[PDB]
Design a protein around this ligand. Structure first.
Ligand code: DFM
Ligand code: BOG
Length: 285
């Protein structure tokens, strides 16, 4: 009701006018939990990690069902109250695209939400693991998978793709919905709260976040800044819809909880502010 929104808006306005995002964000960083990442740091996993400073904790990492090397830089974020799980991963490296799709298949994901661009700051921050119009069919090496591009709808702030993923061995095929938000700079904010929400609701209406499917797979370059921003906003809007009093949602507490599953979620105070703004904006709907 109007009082809940009124409180939400005033609160946001109070924090904004006083420019208090920096400190809130600082307490979150200073209080974030730290768990071991032994597997991530194993020598054999060196070229499976894009950055040495971004690793998945052991307890929540995603394990490939293979026997050779079940390691991938992806973490399982599980939010009980909100009743949603998300997989947050780094942008695939040229040598981990098979793994990426293996994980999608094994986790039974229906959707993949991409928040970065392939080239950022002059270098490859994400190998193109999906097919292009010219060569609509990709075959992934020793992961025994086949991916084909069914449709592509390029819009102003994002692109939506229908992909068909096939297990070459069993011949089972599955529909994968790819949601590429193409205008979110690394360490920056989205185009606007409205393009972001429009994007998020688009992912929601697709049925990719429902418990009928494995967890949505979300990534950016490192899988913590933008990926964390996207997931914190979704989860908070979820809690706002599930609780008797939506105004009781504790953004800092919710982000700290998510941070138990993967380090660095939300990389700048402006990304924390944007996330908050996306929630009270989305709460209207
Ligand atoms: C090869 C390698 O490991 N290089 C390191 C060197 C380094 C620099 C500064 C501090 C610590 C380590 C590196 O670049 N790490 C990056 C990792 C990183 C890159 C981008 C992001 C991100 F938010 F955009 P997103 O998760 O939205 O893709 C978050 C974290 C960094 N910290 O900026
Ligand atoms: C991410 C979105 C989080 C929304 C949480 C909003 C919590 C509102 O919090 C309320 O704001 C009022 C207005 O300043 C204050 O007067 C109340 O004391 C305070 O509890």
């Amino acid at each position: 009701h109007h009082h809940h929104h009124h409180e939400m808006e005033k609160e946001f306005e109070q924090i904004d006018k006083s420019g208090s995002w920096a400190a809130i964000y600082q307490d979150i960083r200073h209080e974030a939990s730290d768990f071991p990442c032994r597997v991530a740091k194993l020598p054999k996993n060196k070229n499976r990690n894009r950055y040495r400073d971004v690793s998945p904790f052991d307890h929540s990492r995603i394990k490939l069902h293979q026997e050779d090397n079940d390691y991938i830089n992806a973490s399982l974020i599980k939010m009980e109250e909100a009743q949603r799980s998300y997989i947050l991963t780094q942008g695939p490296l040229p040598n981990t695209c098979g793994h990426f799709w293996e994980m999608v298949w094994e986790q039974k994901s229906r959707g993949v939400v991409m928040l970065n661009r392939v080239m950022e700051k002059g270098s490859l921050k994400c190998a193109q693991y999906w097919p292009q119009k010219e060569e609509k069919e990709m075959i992934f090496e020793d992961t025994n998978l086949k991916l084909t591009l069914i449709s592509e709808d390029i819009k102003s702030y994002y692109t939506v793709r229908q992909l068909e993923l096939e297990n070459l061995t069993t011949q089972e095929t599955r529909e994968i919905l790819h949601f590429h938000y193409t205008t979110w700079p690394d360490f920056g904010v989205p185009e606007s709260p409205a393009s972001f929400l429009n994007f998020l609701f688009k992912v929601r209406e697709s049925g990719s976040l429902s418990p009928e499917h494995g967890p949505v797979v979300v990534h950016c370059s490192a899988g913590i800044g933008r990926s964390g921003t996207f997931c914190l906003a979704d989860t908070c809007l979820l809690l706002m819809d599930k609780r008797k009093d939506p105004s009781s949602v504790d953004i800092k507490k919710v982000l700290l909880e998510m941070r138990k599953f993967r380090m660095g979620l939300i990389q700048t105070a402006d990304q924390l502010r944007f996330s908050y703004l996306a929630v009270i904006e989305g709460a209207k709907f």
